[PDB]
Amino acid sequence: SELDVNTDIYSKVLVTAVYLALFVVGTVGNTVTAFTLTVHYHLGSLALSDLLTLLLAMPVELYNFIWVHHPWAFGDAGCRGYYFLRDACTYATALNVASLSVERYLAICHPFKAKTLMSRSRTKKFISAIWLASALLAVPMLFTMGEQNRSADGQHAGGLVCTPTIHTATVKVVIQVNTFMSFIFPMVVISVLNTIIANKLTVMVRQAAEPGRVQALRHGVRVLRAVVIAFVVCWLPYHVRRLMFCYISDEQWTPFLYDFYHYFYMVTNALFYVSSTINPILYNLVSANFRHIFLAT
């Protein structure tokens, strides 16, 4: 009965270095982005969501999930609240990216309609609903579990292990619903809206044939595609590991698969945080007008 992780020290150091290197960027640049800034409200909201995703979530992992697996510090309520915060931040980030996509699509394709459907007060209402209100509604059923002591150490802190206590059927169902709400829905909306906007921009490029405008629209469409590419490459590993935790036809794991799964957890959460670090880089690259102010501040 494995009481403590079998992960290598080399990984324990390399992954930790990666985590801190992503943390520095996703804190400094994200806070600067929030300071610099009706789409700007959405851009700042997504920046705040990513900053929370990083700051609130990452530090708890170290020494409890990354550097160690046996002991768990926070109590049952503590672990439940930590998972609540993690899932709320994840859902908020995904839904806010989708909201940014739809807002920009409405603003570009039909600006006159946007003038009404995207009023300043209406935009404030939508952003408030999506961020700090929508996330808290979908998480309660998705992260309010933990503190299931299974390690044989028992009383020893290393023996107390936090894990979702729901039954295999119920837990699997809730993870499936979580993936459906956080990945397929916002991915679908983002993909379709970005494809429509990319088609419009490509049409403009074809008709445009000025060099500055051509470069601007080409970079815009390239970044519009890179947004979904980054979304998939950074989220699909995380959701896939989360599902294959549950979507398994048997309870038998070979030890090699156990260590591989732990390494997979490390890299997948690293990618999940990388996703939150990306936003300022693309914000700077896609807009020189924003780039200069970002560098100034």
């Binding site: 894990t163 935790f245 038998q252 794991w253």
Partner: peptide
Amino acid sequence: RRPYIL
């Protein structure tokens, strides 16, 4: 050997 971390 079923894991625990999420």
